[PDB]
Amino acid sequence: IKLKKDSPVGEILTRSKYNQNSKYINYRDLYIGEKFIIRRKSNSQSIN
Amino acid sequence: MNINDNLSINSPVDNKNVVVVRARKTDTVFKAFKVAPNIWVAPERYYGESLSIDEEYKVDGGIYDSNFLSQDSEKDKFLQAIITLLKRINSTNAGEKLLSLISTAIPFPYGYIGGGYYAPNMITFGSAPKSNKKLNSLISSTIPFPYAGYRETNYLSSEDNKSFYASNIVIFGPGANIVENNTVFYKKEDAENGMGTMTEIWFQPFLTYKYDEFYIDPAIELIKCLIKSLYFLYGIKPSDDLVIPYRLRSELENIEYSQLNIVDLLVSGGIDPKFINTDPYWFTDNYFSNAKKVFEDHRNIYETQIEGNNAIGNDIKLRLKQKFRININDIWELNLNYFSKEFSIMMPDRFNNALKHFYRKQYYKIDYPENYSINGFVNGQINVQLSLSDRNQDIINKPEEIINLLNNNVSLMRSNIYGDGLKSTVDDFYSNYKIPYNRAYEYHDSSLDNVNIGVIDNIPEIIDVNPYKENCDKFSPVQKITSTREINTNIPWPINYLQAQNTNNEKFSLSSDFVEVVSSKDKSLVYSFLSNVMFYLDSIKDNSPIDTDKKYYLWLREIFRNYSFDITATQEINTDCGINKVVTWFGKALNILNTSDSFVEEFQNLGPISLINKKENLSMPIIEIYGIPMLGLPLNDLNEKLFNIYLKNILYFKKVYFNFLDQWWTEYYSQYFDLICMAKQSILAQEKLIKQIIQNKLQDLFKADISMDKLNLMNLATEKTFIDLSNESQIAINNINDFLNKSAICVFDTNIYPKFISFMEQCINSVNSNVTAFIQKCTNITEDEKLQLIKLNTFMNIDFEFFDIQSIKDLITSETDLIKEEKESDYNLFLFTLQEDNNKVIEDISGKNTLVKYSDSISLVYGVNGDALYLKEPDESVSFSNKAFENGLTNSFSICFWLRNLGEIITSKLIENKADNCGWEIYFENNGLVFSIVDCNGNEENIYLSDVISKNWYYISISIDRLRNQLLIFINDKLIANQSIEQILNIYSSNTISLVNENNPIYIEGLSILNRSITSEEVVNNYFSYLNNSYIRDISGERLEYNKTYELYNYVFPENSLYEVTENNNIYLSIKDTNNLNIQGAKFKLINIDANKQYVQKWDEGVVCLLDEEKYVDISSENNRIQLVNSKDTAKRIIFNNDIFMPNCLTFAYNNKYLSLSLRDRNYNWMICNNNDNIPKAAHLWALKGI
């Protein structure tokens, strides 16, 4: 998912891949997209 | 794409959608109906093949009839069937994409009459009239002279040879052989040279066949034909000599192979293509390179020449664009597996091109607006009711081999073994095939993505067609004669045993002596391996004849139990690849290792290889490992070159491994699949005999003094028992399937992989020698550096070790297996409730689609885990309807739900399935439940489950297992009742389970009915996992909530409530003394940081408030006890938790220190923050009761 420039809806984009120098190694990048964070709702549990 | 469904055989010939064209350049014409752009249907039979072939030329397993599709009614039915199939294909997105690609993939048109696809000539027309001063001779209009002159080859010519209609696909009827779908090109030269050609399809939509436990959808056969036609449309058709080894003919006495064309392998799908389409490729031919080059040439011709031409039409220019949008690899990587997955259609998955040899097909007739539809088969692919076609008697049977079991020279038995029907080669393909080194040395479900339905639909139809004179060649039918050898043997074959297990009489008797069965002059003995059933029948022999209904019920139950025990007999042994459940009776049926002792003993002592009769079929492929080419280079360049050589050699080793895997699949797994098929035939034969014996007994008992109603009860019970016998046969079938699949994987592990390791060790020796020689010939590097380099480029054994049992288990599992796994459910009813937003929905999500009828007075609450039905209004009812709920004599089931009664003590009905007298029911009584089951003979079983009081959750699980004659009843996580129901007989009841309230507000949660019995371990697991939902509960079982008056109890003392004690000007709370039991307990409340939270959860910080001065809990660091203060800020924030195995009990923690009860102290027990182990670990568990 990537945040759209105009619409307030995340658009779906195809992940990149590795085609730099080696055909023996293939994968897709995972550090792409928007950086999500998670926050508490009521702060009722233990801070520790 | 939109299929023209408004056509019929009575429609007039309008020369636009209904035409009468000429078949090739013969003297015969045929009608044709256009159902889509460039897609036509010819409802008559094919014209090329004569409908009356000589008897010596009929093929094995083919229905030959020269009267099919002769009347107009049959032709109209055929046309409607093809329309329905096309519409069904078009419904799914993938089918629509395939149809659009078929429509838009016109054969490549030729050039102009002089050659070329560039601009045409020009002509000036219409000179303006002469003016008063100017001649105006050159004032005219210039137009392209041969406009749209590209001479297309895809056209049908009318009977007058003056009108031409563009067309890509013509769907004829079947040729000489009724059940034979075929796909034939229009011109071979234009089909093999990248140009393209018209395609004709012979299709039979009216006859299907059954495989395993499902019927073949004809839509998938049509899809396969269309995919094969796509090969001709694009011109990528390999030569007929490009074949692959498909199967090893193990039934023969000579080493012969049955081979398949690469087109059929690439289109048919299944598991076979997975053993050739491998990364990296081990099988490569010049065909792929030539096809890619020719396709690229034609794409360039379009892009550079036929694209910018403004004097050709967009009817061709824009279809050629869409045709060349896709790549060739898209067509090659398009098989039946993708459409099977996207359509959820189960299809034969192993050796689907050789199903003629494995078993004989039975054909079922299809009435299209009765059985098929826009959504496919009615009532699914399994539960569709199709009548057996009357043409099954006309199936011609020409065996490939005749096995004669000679006695001592008299033929005791004569059996037929049929052939695959493919091309047979005696030359070993693998030994004469060389794995290429410099070819396919790279590369270490998404193919129809470049097809746009809307873009194809926007193309205008082709109206004006410029003919090409020579677009057809001829049709020469392939006439072949089937040879039949005869093999005389003394040792019986598995086919001989399989035949002996079949009889045509109706007064037979089971026998364990094969020789006696085949030597019986009366032909009254039938071979069977059911030792239990035979023993029981011999035991009851010479006894009182069965005349009463109880006697017949007992006999039927015993027969079913013995059959189930016999067909499901397996023994778990430890094999090299894990644990294998060997089928014990596999030696008796299909005589194999049937010398003496037990089959399992011989199987363990020997290997799995001994099951098949043709071992050691391996052959070393021709290996071409070229040595390294000696120009000087620095260290880095030499290192890079050697690394590249290393990677290439590793990939070559993997290619050889894949070749050996394909050898194992072709030569070894084929025999194991043959064993699987024969075992399935044996199981089915034994099931048929048991059913026939039961039918004989029932029909002989119809001539007795039994009332009619009891006779209908017998018939219903016998039908249910037949369903149960089918279920047991399916269990045995998949048991033997797993056994033999694991056996085949084990035989690869322990019989083929070592040979591959030996061969590649021998090869790696030479590879390392050559590498060392090359690295020593060079002299541009140092000595230590050279030693490091040569040590770095070495080939140990681990380099060429690629075995992975999980990669072979996951390689022989098809999409059909995944569909079966997804559709396999052990639930006859799995009720699911969903509140949504102001619209509650209660429905069965088990996949069996039980009819749920409920009133609007019911509510949905949160009882335990998810929403639960709440019946507060008196006299409510919820009905669940399903056929399987009718029960019967022999079927195991189980009811499982959560119950909470809010009442207080008369007998109120809770769950009923009582049809008049017979049935079963659960109802409240006194202060507990009662489960009563009664049969149709007067026998009753009433079980009183005590200690079920109101305002408490209970997990009721009742299991009836009729294979064990056992009735188990669990409440929560404790077995309550374990009874024997051997005295209980047929309990046939209504098809509706009724849940009532009877003036009692009740919570019912997760009501579930299974089709099998449950064990204690599974019940305990379900009970404990259902409560593991991060919610802290009270002693009542309901969710614990903040701000509620609660009484405190300790687990050690489940009846003493903590009460306030004042001493030394300090107030604590403590257990009540034995002399003071009437003192009222303390009232507690839980306060959280956020007042919005209402329900307590695991790991929640809170404060306990005691109900006049609003006391709060504090911990005194003088005696390490608790005390009560009058300041909220002085309270302690304690953490609430609970143990998974003590659900209705909770623990209070304070910096990793649980609060517990102290030892006795002058008739007191204070809550204290313990750190010592002398207090039992069960003393820190507390309970809160809603007061």
TrEMBL record, chain B:
Annotated Non-toxic nonhaemagglutinin C-terminal domain ranges read 1022-1185
Enzyme superclass (EC): hydrolase
Q: What SUPFAM superfamilies does the entry give?
A: Clostridium neurotoxins, 'coiled-coil' domain, Concanavalin A-like lectins/glucanases, Metalloproteases ('zincins'), catalytic domain
Tell me a Gene Ontology molecular-function term this record carries. zinc ion binding
Ranges for domain Non-toxic nonhaemagglutinin helical:
500-770
Q: Give the EC number(s) listed in the UniProt record.
A: 3.4.24.69
Per UniProt, the keywords (alphabetical) are:
Hydrolase, Neurotoxin, Plasmid, Toxin, Virulence
Q: Which residues form the Clostridium neurotoxin receptor binding N-terminal domain?
A: 839-1014
> Is Zinc included in the keywords of this UniProt record?
no
Residue ranges constituting the Botulinum/Tetanus toxin catalytic chain domain according to the UniProt record: 2-326
Q: Which domain of life is it from?
A: Bacteria
Q: Which InterPro entries match?
A: Bot/tetX_LC (IPR000395), Clostridium_toxin_transloc (IPR036248), ConA-like_dom_sf (IPR013320), NTNH (IPR058583), NTNH_C (IPR013677), NTNH_H (IPR054379), Toxin_rcpt-bd_N (IPR012928)
Q: Name one GO biological process term.
A: proteolysis
Asked if Hydrolase is a keyword of the record, the answer is yes
A GO cellular component entry from the record? extracellular region
Q: Which family does it belong to?
A: Belongs to the botulism non-toxic nonhemagglutinin family.
Which protein are we looking at? Botulinum neurotoxin type B1, nontoxic-nonhemagglutinin component, NTNH
Organism annotation: Clostridium botulinum (strain Okra / Type B1)
Instruction: Identify the coding gene.
Output: ntnH
